Amino acid sequence: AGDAAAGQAKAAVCGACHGADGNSPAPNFPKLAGQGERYLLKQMHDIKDGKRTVLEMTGLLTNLSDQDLADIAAYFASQKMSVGMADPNLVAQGEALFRGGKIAEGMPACTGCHSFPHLGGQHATYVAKQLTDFREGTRTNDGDTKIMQSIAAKLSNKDIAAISSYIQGLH
Numbered sequence: 559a560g561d562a563a564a565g566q567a568k569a570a571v572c573g574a575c576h577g578a579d580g581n582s583p584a585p586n587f588p589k590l591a592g593q594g595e596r597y598l599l600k601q602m603h604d605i606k607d608g609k610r611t612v613l614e615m616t617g618l619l620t621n622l623s624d625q626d627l628a629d630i631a632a633y634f635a636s637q638k639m640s641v642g643m644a645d646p647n648l649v650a651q652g653e654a655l656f657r658g659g660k661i662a663e664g665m666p667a668c669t670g671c672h673s674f675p676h677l678g679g680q681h682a683t684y685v686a687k688q689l690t691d692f693r694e695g696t697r698t699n700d701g702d703t704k705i706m707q708s709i710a711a712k713l714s715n716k717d718i719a720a721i722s723s724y725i726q727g728l729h
């Protein structure tokens with residue numbers, strides 16, 4: 559159990575890339591605001607011990623205690639993710655995939671598990687990178703099941719671009 563109030567100051571070093579409140583202004587860096595505390599904490603441990611490699615964060619988590627990480631996670635989880643706009647040329651394809659999946663190819667809809675990390679409002683650039691990394695097996699911290707890797711295997715590049723654009727505007 560983290561202390562959100564204590565996490566705010568401990569999160570100051572993170573704001574340079576993720577935003578003071580976790581709402582990053584630049585699309586390369588993911589928004590952390592409003593993300594689930596348990597998801598955030600798991601990603602922090604995965605990044606810290608190398609199960610998920612984020613070279614841009616090398617050395618930042620090294621000296622944070624497990625309590626420090628829980629406080630920071632609690633702080634970001636207490637914020638609210640800001641919501642962007644979808645591209646009108648892509649949003650229909652992206653929303654149809656998000657709500658309906660690809661029934662023909664046995665791909666479940668995203669709404670089954672993602673309303674679990676929060677997705678709605680996340681930068682499209684960041685989401686597309688994660689879906690592509692999942693598909694290519696470069697991100698592998700999705701458990702022994704490899705659910706996201708198996709799901710992203712069914713998405714084309716056009717699918718990923720459209721779903722990512724839809725998610726960016728989702729609220």
Ligand code: HEC
Nearest residue numbers: 571572574575586587588598601602612614615618630687
């Ligand atoms: C830029 C120099 C960063 C600073 C300072 C911090 N983070 Fe970071 N973080 C950065 C990038 C480029 C990425 C994404 C890499 C990729 O997969 O494309 C991240 C990612 C995270 C995550 C994962 C978020 C998710 O949605 O899965 C977390 C939990 C995270 N970062 C936490 C975190 C904390 C706690 C920081 C302060 C100590 C911090 N980051 C600083 C870049 C940068």
Ligand code: HEC
Nearest residue numbers: 666667668670671674675685688689699700705706709721
């Ligand atoms: C349940 C079986 C899921 C379905 C169906 C989909 N996703 Fe998923 N996703 C799931 C989990 C359990 C996780 C967390 C993995 C971890 O590293 O612990 C994820 C993760 C994502 C992410 C990364 C989020 C982040 O902040 O980096 C994205 C972008 C994502 N999932 C997207 C996504 C889409 C577009 C889906 C439908 C096509 C979808 N997921 C299905 C669980 C499940």
